Ligand binder design. Structure first.
Ligand code: HEM
Ligand code: HEM
Ligand SMILES: C[C@H](O)[C@H](O)[C@H]1CNc2nc(N)[nH]c(=O)c2N1
Ligand SMILES: C[C@H](O)[C@H](O)[C@H]1CNc2nc(N)[nH]c(=O)c2N1
Ligand SMILES: Cc1cc(N)nc(CCCN(C)C)c1
Ligand SMILES: Cc1cc(N)nc(CCCN(C)C)c1
Ligand SMILES: [Zn+2]
Lengths: 412, 412
């Protein structure tokens, strides 16, 4: 019950004890492992104080005032507020702590070496969709910082009864539009055709092109959501060129600078923040491999191999592989030459190994999801391929949640 | 308890029921997943008949004579033999069935679309190390078939008391030698320096070069093992050249045609065959990615990028990625131009999807280990990246076993 994880490139072994503090369930049993399933399987007052207590015990353990009176009174204070209101409110300091540690515990995140440099924006006084748009714009402007990207999170009011929720319906703050065609094919991003749908169904007059930035669909206090278009001066975009292949520009491609997940739920001490958009900087493969070359996304391996003069008749000519490397050297090169923060999969996966080392040392482990930590190209020549990893759920945490256009009791 | 696995490239869903027949344990619990651990965690007469029965029930269920008298008498016959001898002996037909299904159930194998075309060689009458060498040579000659590779397994006598075992100490029948250097570096294959050690410690006069084929270390009936050198005419090797880069040959590289795992244990109806070397044909990435570019193996990304004229100062120039594709196009090209069977990672991963489909259809599922099915380069542009998979242990099965030079009560 004090398990070992081995590196088979360097023979390094580390002992994981942190998994004992694990609480939630993984989906695996003694008889079946689900480590490759993408997402496997209202709260009451009685359930709440345990979670509040457990969170408060580790927060006070963190600043080395574990059993102080400040702890004991905060324990009693939160209990009384869960008695009086059946819920409770986080101190500003407990909100920053819980947010940083939700990132820290995100086992599918390879970037977590940065987990303690997170700017937390307290948006819990927001009441209207216009207010969110304002908070969200301030987040985009800050996090972007003129290409010197900065990591940030904006935390909107916590769930209360359930039907007053606050949701950003967008899956990312900044995404390109998806338009099906009359001939069946797709313009823009096929991932977003169902979301691009609702925007038009709500009055978005679409500039039916490729890289059309979508409008924010913000829902406040369970009310029907409302469209707001981000000032284009705040949407920083990088035009993609190759450092050797001059025909690259005629491909006419670009991506946005800022990756910002907006569809997840932040859980802290048993309180649920259903709108918590958070941003970092891109690892290059997210764009060059998945965004551009997923079959059901932009799907550009066809044209890149064309202008490279490649043997596309035979599968075993690895034309697909060869065009995938060039695309990623160019995504990397274009961001760097505009001073926009980006990290290659080699540097990122090395840092995560080093971070993992710090976590086993000063924390006793580090929950990691191999299936997600290994980059989607050149796997075994990055050091995370050869690193055994233990996956387990720790809290505070980011969780998935139903897409809001399936839950919502819609009306007007 | 009738789980679903989804493909996120094609939206295809399949229902897995086969996992209910799962028996062994995976290493995961409800609270921790070990799907990325490489290998996680004498038999008595009382344990044996259940396993014999379970195996016999599915074998007779397979030829559509489930509850026949031929089944009932074979059940009684094996029971009586487990009473009389505390063990039992497989019919030739039960040996071929069990072997084919051990391959079928090998969840880390992407090639299993071929699982029913397996030539089974019954070596259970063997008694001496010289006999094994003879059986093993006949296997190499057959399986190689002049580059028209054929899949085969040779099954030596089953474990009895424990200290009369039969083991092939080699991890593969055909591997290149590993020699450390006086200056610390390594010649040949660094994976094999500890095994190349014992060979020399047993009288192997090493031709201390790079691609020196190793001698077989065969142990028969628990006796101390003995060296035998495979006739070089039976060891077919492919010289690696690129279809564009003429400097490629001066790298002077070659690999052997036949991949043949020899260090695993075959479990059938509770009987344990500790020497069961089995062979197929190579997926190209096993050679071009892992053998050649693993840091602790041949580690050739240095020199290939050199003669390509690449930016090796900067990590984010993806020089490593670009030299990895070229190496794999050349491994593929060299094998094909000599008519030696090899499969690219695209064709192989497509077939496994199709095989998976057949298994959910006519069998109710297919145990798969994602971490091992996804190829070690260009992951997400092959269809297995996007395919959820359930892992569970079915029997008959191939299992790992201690390296014999740690178990052996050695003497002379
Ligand atoms: C600072 C730079 C960061 C980098 C380079 C980075 C890198 C990555 C990458 C490559 C993924 C793979 C997921 C995918 O393929 O879509 C990921 C997922 C994730 N990241 Fe990080 N990340 C960063 C910052 C952050 C921050 C600030 C947070 C939260 C406060 C965060 C939380 C997560 C979570 C929760 C996931 C997985 C959830 C999901 O996508 O299903 N990351 N990250
Ligand atoms: C017919 C062509 C075959 C191909 C193309 C193929 C392909 C592969 C590949 C790529 C792996 C990855 C393992 C690694 O990276 O080292 C693997 C593993 C494995 N194969 Fe298959 N295979 C074939 C035939 C067979 C046969 C005939 C058997 C047994 C009778 C078998 C049983 C296994 C097992 C048990 C493993 C995993 C055990 C381990 O390596 O730890 N395969 N195979
Ligand atoms: C730590 C990790 O389990 C290890 O690198 C595994 C990952 N997946 C693999 N997959 C295959 N096919 N072969 C391997 O050697 C490995 N190595
Ligand atoms: C089926 C499989 O779980 C799915 O393709 C996963 C695999 N690993 C991944 N890893 C990352 N980082 N991102 C992904 O979208 C996925 N997709
Ligand atoms: C914070 C953050 C960092 C990063 N590098 N990438 C993202 C986008 C993740 C998109 N996937 C959820 C589809 C977010
Ligand atoms: C039968 C078989 C097929 C294949 N394609 N490859 C192998 C070698 C596997 C080596 N690993 C165990 C290190 C064996
Ligand atoms: Zn698992």
């Amino acid at each position: 019950r004090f398990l070992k994880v081995k590196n088979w490139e360097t023979d390094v072994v580390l002992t994981d004890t942190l998994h004992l503090k694990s609480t939630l369930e993984t989906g695996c049993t003694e008889h079946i492992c689900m480590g490759s399933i993408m997402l496997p399987s209202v709260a009451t007052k009685d359930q709440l104080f345990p979670l509040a207590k457990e969170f408060l015990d580790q927060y006070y353990s963190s600043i080395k005032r574990f059993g102080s009176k400040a702890h004991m009174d905060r324990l009693e204070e939160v209990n009384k507020e869960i008695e009086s209101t059946s819920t409770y409110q986080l101190k500003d300091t407990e909100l920053i702590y819980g947010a940083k540690h939700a990132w820290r515990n995100a086992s599918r995140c390879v970037g977590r070496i940065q987990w303690s440099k997170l700017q937390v924006f307290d948006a819990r006084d927001c009441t209207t969709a216009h207010g969110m748009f304002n908070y969200i714009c301030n987040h985009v402007k800050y996090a972007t910082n003129k290409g010197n990207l900065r990591s940030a999170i904006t935390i909107f009011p916590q769930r209360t009864d359930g039907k007053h929720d606050f949701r950003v319906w967008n899956s990312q703050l900044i995404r390109y539009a998806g338009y099906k065609q009359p001939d069946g094919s797709t313009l823009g991003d096929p991932a977003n055709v169902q979301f691009t749908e609702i925007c038009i169904q709500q009055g978005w007059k679409a500039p039916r092109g490729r890289f059309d930035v979508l409008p924010l669909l913000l829902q406040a206090n369970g009310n029907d959501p409302e469209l707001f278009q981000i000032p284009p001066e705040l949407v920083l975009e990088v035009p993609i060129r190759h450092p050797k292949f001059d025909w690259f520009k005629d491909l006419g491609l670009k991506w946005y600078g800022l990756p910002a997940v907006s569809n997840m739920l932040l859980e802290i001490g048993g309180l649920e923040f259903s709108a918590c958009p958070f941003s970092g900087w891109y690892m290059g493969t997210e764009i060059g491999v998945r965004d551009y070359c997923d079959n059901s996304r932009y799907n550009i391996l066809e044209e890149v191999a064309k202008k490279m003069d490649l043997d596309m008749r035979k599968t075993s000519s690895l034309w697909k592989d060869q065009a995938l490397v060039e695309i990623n050297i160019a995504v990397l090169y274009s961001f760097q030459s505009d001073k926009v923060t980006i990290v290659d999969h080699h540097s990122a996966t090395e840092s995560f190994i080093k971070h993992m080392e710090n976590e086993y040392r000063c924390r006793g482990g580090c929950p990691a999801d191999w299936v997600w930590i290994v980059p989607p190209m050149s796997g075994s020549i990055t050091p995370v391929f050869h690193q055994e990893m233990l996956n387990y759920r720790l809290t505070p945490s980011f969780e998935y949640q139903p897409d809001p256009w399936n839950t919502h009791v819609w009306k007007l």
